[PDB]
Amino acid sequence: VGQLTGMYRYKYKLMRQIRMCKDLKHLIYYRFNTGPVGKGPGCGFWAAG
Amino acid sequence: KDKSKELHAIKERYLRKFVF
Amino acid sequence: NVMLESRFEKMYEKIDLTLLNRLLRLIVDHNIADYMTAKNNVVINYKDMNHTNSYGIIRGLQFASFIVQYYGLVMDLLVLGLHRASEMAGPPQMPNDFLSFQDIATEAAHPIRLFCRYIDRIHIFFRFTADEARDLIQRYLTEHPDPNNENIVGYNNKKCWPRDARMRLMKHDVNLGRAVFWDIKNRLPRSVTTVQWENSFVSVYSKDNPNLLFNMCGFECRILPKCRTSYEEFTHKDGVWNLQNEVTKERTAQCFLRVDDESMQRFHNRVRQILMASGSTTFTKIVNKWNTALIGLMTYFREAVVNTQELLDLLVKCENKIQTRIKIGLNSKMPSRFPPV
Amino acid sequence: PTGEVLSLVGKLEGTRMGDKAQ
Amino acid sequence: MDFLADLMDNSELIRNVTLCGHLHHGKTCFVDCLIEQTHPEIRKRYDQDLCYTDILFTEQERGVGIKSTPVTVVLPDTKGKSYLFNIMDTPGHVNFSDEVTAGLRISDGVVLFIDAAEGVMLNTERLIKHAVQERLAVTVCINKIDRLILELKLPPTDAYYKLRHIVDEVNGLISMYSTDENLILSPLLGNVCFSSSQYSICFTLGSFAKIYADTFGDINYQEFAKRLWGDIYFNPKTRKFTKKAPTSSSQRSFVEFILEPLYKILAQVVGDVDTSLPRTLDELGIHLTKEELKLNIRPLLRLVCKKFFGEFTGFVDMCVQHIPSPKVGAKPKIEHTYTGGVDSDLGEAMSDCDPDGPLMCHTTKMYSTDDGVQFHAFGRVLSGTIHAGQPVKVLGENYTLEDEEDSQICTVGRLWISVARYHIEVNRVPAGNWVLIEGVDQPIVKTATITEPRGNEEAQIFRPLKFNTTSVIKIAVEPVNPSELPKMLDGLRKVNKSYPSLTTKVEESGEHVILGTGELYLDCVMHDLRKMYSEIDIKVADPVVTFCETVVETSSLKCFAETPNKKNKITMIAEPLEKGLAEDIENEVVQITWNRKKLGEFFQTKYDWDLLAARSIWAFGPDATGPNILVDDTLPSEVDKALLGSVKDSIVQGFQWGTREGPLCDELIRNVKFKILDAVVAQEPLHRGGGQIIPTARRVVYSAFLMATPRLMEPYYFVEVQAPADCVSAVYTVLARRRGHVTQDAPIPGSPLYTIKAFIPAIDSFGFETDLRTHTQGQAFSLSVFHHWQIVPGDPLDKSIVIRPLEPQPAPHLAREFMIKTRRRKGLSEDVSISK
Amino acid sequence: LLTDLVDDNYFYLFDLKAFFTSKALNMAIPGGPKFEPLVRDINLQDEDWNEFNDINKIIIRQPIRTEYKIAFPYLYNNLPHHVHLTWYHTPNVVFIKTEDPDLPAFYFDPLINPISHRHSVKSQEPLPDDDEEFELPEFVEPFLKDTPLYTDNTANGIALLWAPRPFNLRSGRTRRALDIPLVKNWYREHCPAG
Amino acid sequence: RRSRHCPYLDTINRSVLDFDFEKLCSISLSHINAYACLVCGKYFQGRGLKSHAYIHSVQFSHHVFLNLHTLKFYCLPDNYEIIDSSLEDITYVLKPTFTKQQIANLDKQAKLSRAYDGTTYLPGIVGLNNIKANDYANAVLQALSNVPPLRNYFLEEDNYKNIKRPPGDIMFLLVQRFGELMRKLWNPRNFKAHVSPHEMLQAVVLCSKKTFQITKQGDGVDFLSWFLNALHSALGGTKKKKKTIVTDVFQGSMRIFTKKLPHPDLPAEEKEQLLHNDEYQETMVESTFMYLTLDLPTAPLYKDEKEQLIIPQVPLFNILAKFNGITEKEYKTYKENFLKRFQLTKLPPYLIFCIKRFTKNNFFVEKNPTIVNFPITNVDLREYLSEEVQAVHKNTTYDLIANIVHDGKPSEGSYRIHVLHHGTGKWYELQDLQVTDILPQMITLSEAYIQIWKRR
Ligand SMILES: O=P(O)(O)O[C@H]1[C@@H](OP(=O)(O)O)[C@@H](OP(=O)(O)O)[C@@H](OP(=O)(O)O)[C@@H](OP(=O)(O)O)[C@H]1OP(=O)(O)O
């Protein structure tokens, strides 16, 4: 959301959400891209964000 | 190295920009 | 070895004018003494408020310093005593040095071995034999019993040093420090002057305490003798005085310097009053005041800066504040990549 | 490049204070 | 309510039982089930347990029982005989074993709770051994039966095999401690009960046979229960019980009639709620409403087992049959506890448990109030009744008939019968009951005897409480503000009243040391001190263990000491004791009070000491059962035996004091034998005074012990861990890291978990539990108990060894370091002054 | 999406109470978060070399870790204020899940160490004279003989007992899609190694 | 019979014998069987074999011990009783028991008693040792010890013993230890010239529930009020008695006329109709007091025209213009003002005057330094009593016997006490340890805070 919209410029506290949304990604991606599946733009578990 | 880590731990116990 | 650093709390405000006049007539012509003491009794005025100063001395007088340097001298005779004061000052025809004695026996013939009064801050260095220290401790505890071992509560310490490098509040050492301070305080009459424990520091070096701490002239000093707890006699560290024995010409002790917290706070407040009183002021004047203050501090300490790692951060923060003040003066919106040229 | 005065706590500690003085 | 009070008068209808077992084995949950059965308005929540006896805030947060709780409730029997039960719900943690003993002394029966899946564990063995030592009746309850069904999914034959192995192992354990053959256990004997307190299942063979007889009729439930266990099979061709299997795969009677229906009901409830549960409940006669079938699996299972099994009558009948009432169970209790013995007139009167006899209470617990400023004593009445607002005489642990100094007259205020959460005020409490006495807290410290004043003056005290294990963990405790020093002391007093094994001692340097058994025990002690007793800030030193001192060689030269009177000379030598002899003294295998002819024969037989030399034994030190022995070996023709016997007592006190305060680091002395080789006693009676002999005796003891090669002894804990079979290597690694060696690693029969038994240094056990649980990610759990003193490697008197502060020293540098710092902690001198 | 954890022994010092303790005590579990101190107390953080806390009197064998000061907070550090006591030890829930449906629900899995009923000591117990005095009536049978020992749902019903919170319930209340954190238990547990 | 022939009687040193400490063992911290080693003055676990007292006897070579409770002496290395006349004084130091003949003779004493250290002192006028800067409690306790009837009541134990107590009532601990301290103060054969209230301060802290701590220094008026109210509760059975030793000595009866003042922002007709509505009319309410609180005039806030910076003074009778029908005090509240004029009914035999200092203004607390101008010999309160009760109270003359004075700012101040020796008529001030002989005239030139008056 920070890269797409850049809404953190008008609310810095919103960064707390942004840093979380990236964090969740690291939680999900490395559980997702674990087996034969590798890194790539295919993960679609969008519930957390 | 790791042997001195234990001693260092004992001694320590007793003695603008947006960042995504 | 116990060192007591303290100061007469309100000597300036408690110099009795009649007693001061008598003491001055002792050393100077009675006309001069009367003139000085009468000059110390004038009307203090400020705006709509005015009164008459009849108890303390006025420090704005040009000769007032002399008076202080005389009055404090009397306190020395009350602290050291006539015998020890004469031993320190040497014979009247062969005056001694600042810290020296005519003979070694005179040096070792009294607990008080070093003394310096400065203006109002007295530093005293006692060396106590075990029997003498024990006797002083018992004499102090006779009228000040401490069943709860509460002597450690109010004991001031130099928190700027780490726990191992600080003074260790052992029971016997703290008792000796309290005993020494009480003995010194008993000598001075409570009306002519006074010594307060809270605004004083007593540091003892023994088997328990390897470091001798004190603070003088804005310098936080700690001597750690090479004999006991010197793993390496390093010389690369430039903020460390390497004390030497004049007789053996050998490495015996090691002095660590540090800027006192009060000096750092004074410098910070000076920079603050430079900055805040800089509204309709030229940039050159602000930079000149900053340069003068910085050069004064750095050329006064010159070694205690490097060890005081907090002073470095304070100095760079103050420099950044001054540069930000100049930049805001140039333009309200702060620059992003302002140059240092 | 910012021009900000950076603290030298741990920076430039290798050299003595007698350097570059005569 | 009133029937409960009127039931106390009859001493035959009262059972004083204590529910003891290993940590987290269901004792508290079983008491919760009993409370729910007795109290209609008290029901557990569906998710959270009830934990009725867990009244402390610490217990409800740690999840572990901390203190014993009294529960006095009326329970129906199988026939319906409403008995009165005083249950002592004791903690299962080994560190709180003392808290069991406080409840074990005032109990006539023991209910050993054993987890079905885990089986016999460390604290279980310790508790059965200890209970057998106090000559108490032992009955076993296997709790958590559902773990064989809902967790292991064992076949019913294998579940029976696991239960039989569990019961047979306790039988092989009691035989190691009980000579009486009546202490055998078998569910058909009524000794063994089965239960699952999570789902409110509680049956013995008699109770389940009673259920059968109620369902079908014309069945003798006693005779049926006589054939519901073991290798006995059932033949439906003859409808008869045969010792031989009627068919090829005939299941046993227990499997077919007891385990099979329980397995099937649990399977239907947990798997077939919607399909077959109503049908099987109609078959079993259980009717559940439509809303009661909407509950989740666990509440529904608990409800359906409550309906089918009903009351906990099997537990009641087991306790009634195999645990003596106070009236019949008083005589062994008086013999093992009363110091004057059963032969005494007061002992004979107390053996009858007469409610009209002289008042004789035995307070063993001390419970704090809400505000913590007043303590209520808790004890068993053994003779007579105690009335509210009545002056009584409260003795102490040091009281003797010759010394009325330790007894203070106090007025008994209100009296309560205590049942967990609440207390019912009463006027009088007849003999054989448990009572909370208010107003007698001041003279009581740990354990006291309450009797009547101005009468029954020939009344000694009950024996001081004897604990399973020695407390060796030591923590120094100071106030953050020295101005608040008295409050801490006050708080210290309170914890000393509240923990039976706690030992608060002020040292020479002024440090107040608290003695505890383990990390959790001391953590709870400090929580109680900080939060409810002192209510002040407290500084706690790093935990350390207590050390002892021993010798390994005979003293090189005869060590002599002469009194300041310069008329009495004692020349002594020091020798180490044989292997196991010190343990024999500690275990009270032999006492100094034994007849002297056989006392020497013991050492002549088991240790081949000379009969004359063995008869020369003076006393043990530093206590009556202390592990140090003082032996006379003076030449008969050189020292007058009659004259030497005059100062024998003074030498005994000097020996005891010197052994209690060691010269090395002011600690206990163990495994040392001091031989008196020469005595020169002043012939004048007043020149051999005790005030001169005793310090001289201590000095010569110190000199002989120092000349003999000194060694430091550190406590070694015995640690058993239950971990998955994969985690054994991790436990091995942790123990090897913490200077511990594994003695055994055996699989638990009937469970994948392995039990690893090892010995660890006590001073190296701090954080060992945390290290093991964190490294194994919580799969491995450990319980540590003090086992035995062992010589620490290294020479403790080596002056050349240099100690580096803030470094774990190597092994040869341990014994020296363990001395010096300890001396620094005691305020002693830097080194051992041998010339002193 | 569900970890096959049977009991919360996995969350020994990694649970909510332990993290509250660590935040209150200004330290941090290795896998746990870091917080700004609850109270500054910088002056009291560095106390003087008292005779009580004298290091010359302290025997060091294994350094006191942050976990030790969290496992027993009232024993290992001074001033334990706003601190929480964690659950000591839930009994190890020894649940053995079936790996093949084509196997009886009540089965002696090889994971169980064999009981191995020993016959070294002949177990003797009081049992009456066999098949001579006691006879059951013809109407007396085990309570549930018609009912089978296990159905097809017995293994799955038992495995439902040792299931995460949403899946061990028979009924419940409907939640919002917002209020269901699917990955909440992923970071509540320890980070995977490597 | 080896008793009565001990050789260690010369070993006893009465100088170090301080019994003001708590009677708990210095090693086991056990309050039972407390034994004090007379050679060193340290308490131990108790007499007996393998006991801490026995260990100290065989270690320090100290033989004679005194049992704290039984008041008997023993030799521990041999453990036999000791009976000697010369030891009686020691027991009389530990448990000073006063006979009824001696109790009534304490107010007629004019002899400077001799201690063991030679520091002559007057009984009752004994310095209370400051522990942790709590001189307010020492001053209040000295003032109450100077009261003759209260002292005579507390000098004999059976006066306040064998009274029924509630099971959870720790209030007794405040009254059973006050008697001990008071009989320590009036003991004319003390080993030490001073007395340490350290034992009673523990009971004060425990009973007050952490307030009036030893370390902090609370207000003397508040502590006096709490102590007088607690002693009243501590005496009697489970239900408090109407006439305890505090009610008949300090409590008097006062009448209050509480009239509600109407809000100023009201119409005059509306004001008078509200007055007529009985909502804003006087309501006579009787009450009882332990002390009379005297409000002081506000500081002048300005220099005088002639004598700049003149200390403010007020005559006592101007302060005592309260408690009469003529004068009124507009007591202001955040809700509404009230007109409360007082009227004394029954004057207590001992009247305590608490002068209102340490007033909390809108931003902090400040002391009113106004000097109270009062006589110390003879007054008359007949003008301060209603005509109905003037006949009942034939005596209205009070003499100052005790005076509390606070020196220094309210942030940190010392509490000095001037006590009038009833036997001799002299005035002595005692600030903790320090005792001096201030002239009776110089008593009234102090910033008085609490005073005690005797009607004779
Ligand atoms: O971790 P971040 O710096 O926030 O960037 C991540 C990261 O890229 P980096 O490797 O540069 O850190 C991931 O990549 P890997 O760590 O797995 O290599 C991931 O991409 P993949 O998991 O698909 O490789 C993701 O990318 P996205 O969320 O766009 O799929 C995103 O990279 P960007 O946010 O820079 O695209």
Numbering used by the authors:
A (entry chain A): 585 to 633
B (entry chain G): 241 to 255, 270 to 274
C (entry chain A): 974 to 1314
D (entry chain B): 36 to 57
E (entry chain C): 116 to 951
F (entry chain A): 245 to 438
G (entry chain U): 100 to 555
What does the paper say about this structure?
Here cryo-electron microscopy analyses of human CE pre-B complex and B-like complexes reveal extensive structural similarities with their CI counterparts. Add-back experiments using purified CE pre-B complexes, coupled with cryo-electron microscopy, elucidate the order of the extensive remodelling events that accompany the formation of B complexes and B-like complexes. The molecular triggers and roles of B-specific proteins in these rearrangements are also identified.
The cryo-EM structures of the protomers of affinity-purified CE pre-B dimers incubated with 5′ss oligo (designated pre-B5′ss) or with 5′ss oligo plus ATPγS (designated pre-B5′ss+ATPγS) were determined at 4.2 Å and 3.1 Å, resolution, respectively, at their tri-snRNP cores. A single 5′ss oligo is also bound in pre-B5′ss+ATPγS complexes. Notably, the addition of ATPγS or ATP to pre-B5′ss complexes leads to repositioning of the BRR2 helicase domain and to substantial restructuring of other tri-snRNP components. Furthermore, in contrast to the situation in the B-like complex, in pre-B5′ss+ATPγS, BRR2NC is in an inactive conformation, in which the separator loop tightly interacts with the Sec63 domain, thereby blocking access of the U4 snRNA to the RNA-binding region of the BRR2NC RecA domains. The U4 snRNA quasi-pseudoknot is dissolved in pre-B5′ss+ATPγS, accompanied by displacement of RBM42 and SNRNP27K, but U4/U6 stem III is still present and, together with the U4 Sm core, adopts a new position. Instead, U4/U6 stem III is stabilized in pre-B5′ss+ATPγS by both RNA and protein interactions, in particular by the capture of U6 C37 by a newly identified structural element of U2 SF3A1.
